[PDB]
């Protein structure tokens, strides 16, 4: 089963990485699942949706009373170092609510880091439907 561990906000970075200590330590984690457009785009730098999708991460990470992190059962890192997680923000998923407001995609799943695939697929089903963001 997973399990959620507290840790603390150091600084947002994009729409799709946060900063956190963790255990003592700070490390960068990079949210589970999602693609959101990017402000630090390796190639294209500032993409379109960018820097709301950064806007809104920031936002409900700075908010929150309590952050928790939880692993998924595969590998916890990726090759650059960052800590691969679902995020919350006073129980509310960050990874979910991004995708839910449109300003994220489903990323190509790597199983067995796929535990709330279905669910998120599910949230942008919704979003799809709805012309959110992304899909306007």
Do not use: C
Request: charged share 30%; net charge positive.
């Amino acid at each position: 089963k997973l399990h959620k561990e507290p840790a603390t906000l150091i600084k947002a970075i994009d729409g799709d990485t946060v900063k956190l200590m963790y255990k003592g330590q700070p490390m960068t984690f990079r949210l589970l699942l999602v693609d959101t457009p990017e402000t630090k785009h390796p190639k294209k730098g500032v993409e379109k949706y960018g820097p709301e999708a950064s806007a809104f991460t920031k936002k409900m990470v700075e908010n929150a009373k309590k952050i928790e992190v939880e692993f998924d059962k595969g590998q916890r890192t990726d090759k650059y170092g960052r800590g691969l997680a679902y995020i919350y923000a006073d129980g509310k998923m960050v990874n979910e609510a991004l995708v839910r407001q449109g300003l994220a995609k489903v990323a190509y799943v790597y199983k067995p880091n796929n535990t709330h695939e279905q669910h998120l697929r599910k949230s942008e089903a919704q979003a799809k439907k709805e012309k959110l963001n992304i899909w306007s």
